[model samples]
Target: MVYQVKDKADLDGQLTKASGKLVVLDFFATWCGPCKMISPKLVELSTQFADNVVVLKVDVDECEDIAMEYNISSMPTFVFLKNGVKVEEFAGANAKRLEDVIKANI
Candidate 1:
């Protein structure tokens, strides 16, 4: 399952909880068409790789602080973290690449 990050504190908490696991921080906006388009694939992949991945969704509008921290100007950007350190990031809703990146990281 995907996790909803409420704020910077929540994001930090989730990162801590994820520990050795790969944390995929999804920065998206509700009004973004691409975000809606890739939502399902993200959900499915998160569930499929739940054992080693923790997917956290950060709504850019609702969580501006978190979004600001990442300098997120795009709607559907994904940032990968491991042990609370950023390992990789990309901006888009490419489902195939998303899965590939997850596999490569985890």
Candidate 2:
């Protein structure tokens, strides 16, 4: 299932729980084509790495404050967080690049 980030208050708790595992915080908007294109792949990745990673999608339009706090300027930005801290980040919908990132992290 897709983890939906509702508010800033939930971020800390969620990230804390996701510690030790590779957590991907997807910053996206409903209207973003790239976001839509990569969504299914994200779900598949979540299942494939069920034991090693967690995937969460945050709607920037819905959570503007959090988006701004993270300085999210583009859609489909993937923020890789490990142990509640950001380790790396990238923007776009390249599945191969995403796979590479996850594989490296794992």
Candidate 3:
């Protein structure tokens, strides 16, 4: 399951405490159709990379500050972070991109 990113502090904490592993940051809205379409795949990715990546989610409607920090303007955005820094990112419901990104990080 994707962990809810409560606020800026929690986001910072998750990123800083990643222990050099990959961080999958998701920016989404609750009612987004594509977000609903992609969340399960994300959960699968999280489980597949449980030992290599950490997954965190920020609801655009719920956590505006953090979403604004990243300038999130899409329904679902997947960001791959390494050592608290962004390495790669993509938008929408592409499962292959997600898999490729995770595999690349690993």
- State which candidate has the highest lDDT: 1
Q: Which pairs, if any, clash in model 2?
A: none
Per-residue CA lDDT of candidate 3, range 1-106, in tens?
A: 5788889999888888889898999888989899899888888888877888889988988888888888988879988899857899889988888888899987
User: Candidate 1, which segments miss by more than 4 Å at Cα?
Assistant: none
lDDT of each: 0.90, 0.88, 0.87
lDDT-wise, the better of 2 and 3 is 2
Residue-wise C-alpha lDDT for candidate 2, range 1-106, written one tens digit per residue: 6789899978778888875999888999999899999988898888888989888888999899999998999888999988767788989999888888988896
TM-score of each: 0.96, 0.94, 0.95
Q: Which candidate do you rate higher for TM-score, 1 or 3?
A: 1
Q: Give the lowest summed-lDDT range of ten residues in model 2.
A: 10-19
RMSD of 1: 0.8
Instruction: Give the lDDT of residue 12 in candidate 1.
Output: 84
Top-scoring candidate (TM-score)? 1
**Whole-structure CA lDDT of model 1:** 0.90
